[PDB]
Scaffold this active site. Structure first.
Site, PDB file in Angstrom:
ATOM      1  N   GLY A  80       2.993   6.195   9.646  1.00 11.83           N
ATOM      2  CA  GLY A  80       4.369   6.037   9.228  1.00 11.83           C
ATOM      3  C   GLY A  80       5.077   4.853   9.844  1.00 11.83           C
ATOM      4  O   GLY A  80       6.240   4.607   9.514  1.00 11.83           O
ATOM      5  N   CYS A  92       4.166   1.782   9.285  1.00 10.42           N
ATOM      6  CA  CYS A  92       4.008   0.662   8.371  1.00 10.42           C
ATOM      7  C   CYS A  92       5.346   0.215   7.802  1.00 10.42           C
ATOM      8  O   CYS A  92       6.207   1.032   7.464  1.00 10.42           O
ATOM      9  CB  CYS A  92       3.056   1.046   7.248  1.00 10.42           C
ATOM     10  SG  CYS A  92       1.409   1.151   7.879  1.00 10.42           S
ATOM     11  N   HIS A 141       0.808  -1.215   0.000  1.00 10.33           N
ATOM     12  CA  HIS A 141       0.000   0.000   0.000  1.00 10.33           C
ATOM     13  C   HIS A 141       0.848   1.275   0.000  1.00 10.33           C
ATOM     14  O   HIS A 141       0.278   2.372  -0.041  1.00 10.33           O
ATOM     15  CB  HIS A 141      -1.004  -0.015   1.162  1.00 10.33           C
ATOM     16  CG  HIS A 141      -0.403   0.145   2.529  1.00 10.33           C
ATOM     17  ND1 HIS A 141      -0.390  -0.875   3.458  1.00 10.33           N
ATOM     18  CD2 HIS A 141       0.129   1.226   3.151  1.00 10.33           C
ATOM     19  CE1 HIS A 141       0.164  -0.442   4.578  1.00 10.33           C
ATOM     20  NE2 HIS A 141       0.494   0.829   4.415  1.00 10.33           N
TER      21      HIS A 141
HETATM   22  C1  LIG Z   1       0.992   2.946   7.936  1.00  7.49           C
HETATM   23  O1  LIG Z   1       2.027   3.875   8.251  1.00  7.49           O
HETATM   24  C2  LIG Z   1      -0.288   3.196   8.742  1.00  7.49           C
HETATM   25  C3  LIG Z   1      -0.140   2.894  10.230  1.00  7.49           C
HETATM   26  C4  LIG Z   1      -1.490   3.050  10.916  1.00  7.49           C
HETATM   27  C5  LIG Z   1      -1.806   4.501  11.265  1.00  7.49           C
HETATM   28  C6  LIG Z   1      -2.087   4.531  12.769  1.00  7.49           C
HETATM   29  N1  LIG Z   1      -1.831   3.179  13.231  1.00  7.49           N
HETATM   30  C7  LIG Z   1      -1.457   2.363  12.245  1.00  7.49           C
HETATM   31  O2  LIG Z   1      -1.119   1.197  12.355  1.00  7.49           O
HETATM   32  N2  LIG Z   1      -1.362   2.353   8.252  1.00  7.49           N
HETATM   33  C8  LIG Z   1      -2.364   2.879   7.563  1.00  7.49           C
HETATM   34  O3  LIG Z   1      -2.560   4.084   7.501  1.00  7.49           O
HETATM   35  C9  LIG Z   1      -3.262   1.936   6.823  1.00  7.49           C
HETATM   36  C10 LIG Z   1      -3.200   2.406   5.377  1.00  7.49           C
HETATM   37  C11 LIG Z   1      -3.778   1.418   4.394  1.00  7.49           C
HETATM   38  C12 LIG Z   1      -3.865   1.807   3.059  1.00  7.49           C
HETATM   39  C13 LIG Z   1      -4.385   0.962   2.090  1.00  7.49           C
HETATM   40  C14 LIG Z   1      -4.815  -0.294   2.492  1.00  7.49           C
HETATM   41  C15 LIG Z   1      -4.733  -0.697   3.827  1.00  7.49           C
HETATM   42  C16 LIG Z   1      -4.209   0.158   4.792  1.00  7.49           C
HETATM   43  N3  LIG Z   1      -4.631   1.997   7.306  1.00  7.49           N
HETATM   44  C17 LIG Z   1      -4.993   1.723   8.558  1.00  7.49           C
HETATM   45  O4  LIG Z   1      -4.254   1.217   9.390  1.00  7.49           O
HETATM   46  C18 LIG Z   1      -6.416   2.061   8.898  1.00  7.49           C
HETATM   47  N4  LIG Z   1      -7.176   0.881   9.249  1.00  7.49           N
HETATM   48  C19 LIG Z   1      -8.075   0.379   8.410  1.00  7.49           C
HETATM   49  O5  LIG Z   1      -8.409   0.960   7.388  1.00  7.49           O
HETATM   50  O6  LIG Z   1      -8.655  -0.921   8.727  1.00  7.49           O
HETATM   51  C20 LIG Z   1      -9.927  -1.294   8.197  1.00  7.49           C
HETATM   52  C21 LIG Z   1     -11.005  -0.281   8.540  1.00  7.49           C
HETATM   53  C22 LIG Z   1     -11.591  -0.296   9.797  1.00  7.49           C
HETATM   54  C23 LIG Z   1     -12.583   0.622  10.132  1.00  7.49           C
HETATM   55  C24 LIG Z   1     -13.009   1.560   9.197  1.00  7.49           C
HETATM   56  C25 LIG Z   1     -12.429   1.585   7.935  1.00  7.49           C
HETATM   57  C26 LIG Z   1     -11.434   0.664   7.608  1.00  7.49           C
HETATM   58  C27 LIG Z   1      -6.461   3.008  10.082  1.00  7.49           C
HETATM   59  C28 LIG Z   1      -7.911   3.179  10.512  1.00  7.49           C
HETATM   60  C29 LIG Z   1      -5.765   4.325   9.759  1.00  7.49           C
END
Ligand SMILES: *[C@H](O)[C@H](C[C@@H]1CCNC1=O)NC(=O)[C@H](Cc1ccccc1)NC(=O)[C@@H](NC(=O)OCc1ccccc1)C(C)C
Ligand SMILES: *[C@H](O)[C@H](C[C@@H]1CCNC1=O)NC(=O)[C@H](Cc1ccccc1)NC(=O)[C@@H](NC(=O)OCc1ccccc1)C(C)C
Lengths: 306, 306
Positions: free
Chosen positions: A143, A145, A41
């Site tokens: 960040g 990830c 991603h």
């Molecule tokens: C990467 O740096 C980042 C780390 C996140 C931010 C705060 N804590 C973390 O672990 N991860 C993300 O921003 C991912 C991005 C992503 C992009 C494309 C595909 C998948 C992931 N997104 C998330 O961690 C988000 N979580 C979800 O979207 O999980 C499913 C969901 C649950 C409830 C409502 C909508 C979607 C998070 C909410 C930022």
């Protein structure tokens, strides 16, 4: 003496942490030999994330669209591919700090250390367990990830986890290093359910053994129980079912402490049925299940690595 | 999101861990520049430990009686001296892995990571706090002596602790890197009393702030309190007295969460007076006091180091 949630020394992993930029998004990557690994991603815009077609998005990218920075020094990307949910960037320079490593897919209930990273720089290191529902209870901001989980066996790093996402729970999901998710999760920003978690009974017992080894013996009771009688109690408390394979794994702790595993289950049963009454065990007022029998044995025998 | 007891990346410290042997005793040493530091009780026999005269014992030693091994490679000891409770071995080869470092004497309530070592090899890494009574609640077996505690500021390692002994409590005592003990302890195998420990009120509040930042807000109550009214409650519960300097330190967390420090104390007061009722905060059923305000801020802003 003493018992602490302890993580592996992170030095060998620090040397593999790089920063990966593609478009506006920047995340961490793992630089082993002449390949940098990271979540796919990274090629997503914020709008792509809601429903990405990763093939189509990746086709728009070429090698030069990937900015890989190792501290100050620079990888030339000379090949990229997608393996499951991971991106593999071929670089022209093998990491001179590559340790002996292997990629491992761990089992729920096992533990590993996380080296939390931002912009390719390590921030901190902590232990945890792959929950029975294939999530981890981590500490991850934006960040983070691409930060990885690992174990060390003397000199060999076993990489087992790469961070991808946070769920609506504050729990975390990710993949092994072939980019297959732990659990039923997909890398899409869409509502996703982890499912009922359970407590890792065999880890709890190993921790009770850790307590006795460190003088905490108040929970040791007058009773014993049967494997099936205890599993009845376990199912009531959303504890995972104790098997004989688990009994065999607890054998060394059993032999060290002179306490039969089923005598320990009987203590555990009265703890589940009556609570702790405001007492603590190893400084905790809850039953702890993120220490494997191996975690315990290693901390009370002093195994080292390098 | 998420909040974890997190330690600093240990890589920079791993590179300084050596094994020191003098007589039959072997412990860990810290190799910075051309000096190796270690506890002076390395020159003690088991019988010496009951009542050692370290001057007299050391006079019996010369440079060649000190075996310093850095993994496989070898320091030639060309000078030794005793500074307080530490031994300083001058070696003919500066450590090529010496990081930017400083020796710091920390204050009770501050935190630092420990890199637990055996035979000069790192075993594990964990966070903790210098208790108000100048002990640490660590995890230390035989041969762990000379393992160090440290903090990192970007690229500079601040060494603050060297392990010397375990008390009859399972608690641990040691020195700074000038070899002065934290607390009233002496390096003699003779009964020694730590004194009444207290809970680090300012760390507890910072952790309550960490909870609110992560959605745990159930303890947030309807009340406020005064600095003197809360300190009355604090003294009843062996909490250290909250000062205005502490209030000022909590300022950033206050501004982030929009919760006044005294509104937080009022929540804390009702937690001390009524307990947690079987609830948890950040996965703990006890009030946690081993996170400084700086620990909290750093974990919810993502500061990195190298
Ligand atoms: C990467 O740096 C980042 C780390 C996140 C931010 C705060 N804590 C973390 O672990 N991860 C993300 O921003 C991912 C991005 C992503 C992009 C494309 C595909 C998948 C992931 N997104 C998330 O961690 C988000 N979580 C979800 O979207 O999980 C499913 C969901 C649950 C409830 C409502 C909508 C979607 C998070 C909410 C930022
Ligand atoms: C160093 O490798 C070792 C690490 C210990 C062993 C288990 N946990 C630890 O932290 N430390 C020691 O063995 C020191 C040796 C020593 C020798 C000369 C002078 C001072 C220390 N000893 C201890 O940690 C022992 N603790 C005490 O002796 O503390 C005072 C005391 C308390 C009650 C009764 C007698 C003496 C420990 C009990 C092994």
């Amino acid at each position: 003496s003493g018992f602490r949630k302890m993580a592996f020394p992170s030095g060998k992993v620090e040397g593999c942490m790089v920063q990966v930029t593609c478009g506006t998004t920047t995340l961490n990557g793992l630089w082993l030999d002449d390949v940098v690994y990271c979540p796919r991603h990274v090629i997503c815009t914020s709008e792509d994330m809601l429903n990405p077609n990763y093939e189509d998005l990746l086709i728009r990218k070429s090698n030069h669209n990937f900015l890989v920075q190792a501290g100050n020094v620079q990888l030339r990307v000379i090949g990229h591919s997608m393996q499951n949910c991971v991106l593999k960037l071929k670089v022209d320079t093998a990491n001179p700090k590559t340790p002996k490593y292997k990629f491992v897919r761990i089992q729920p209930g096992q533990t590993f250390s996380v080296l939390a990273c931002y912009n390719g720089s390590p921030s901190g290191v902590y232990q945890c367990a792959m929950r029975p529902n294939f999530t981890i209870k981590g500490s991850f901001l934006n960040g983070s990830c691409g930060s990885v989980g690992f174990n060390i066996d003397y000199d060999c790093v076993s990489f087992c986890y790469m961070h991808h996402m946070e769920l609506p729970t504050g729990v975390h999901a990710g993949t092994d290093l072939e980019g297959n998710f732990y659990g039923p999760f997909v890398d899409r920003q869409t509502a996703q359910a982890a499912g009922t978690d359970t407590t890792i009974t065999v880890n709890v017992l190993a921790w009770l053994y850790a307590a006795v080894i460190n003088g905490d013996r108040w929970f040791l009771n007058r009773f014993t129980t049967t494997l099936n009688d205890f599993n009845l109690v376990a199912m009531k408390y959303n504890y995972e079912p104790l098997t004989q394979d688990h009994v065999d794994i607890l054998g060394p702790l059993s032999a060290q402490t002179g306490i039969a595993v089923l005598d320990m289950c009987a203590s555990l049963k009265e703890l589940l049925q009556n609570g702790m009454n405001g007492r603590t065990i190893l400084g905790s007022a809850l039953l702890e299940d993120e220490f494997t029998p191996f975690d315990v044995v290693r901390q009370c025998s002093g195994v080292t690595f390098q």
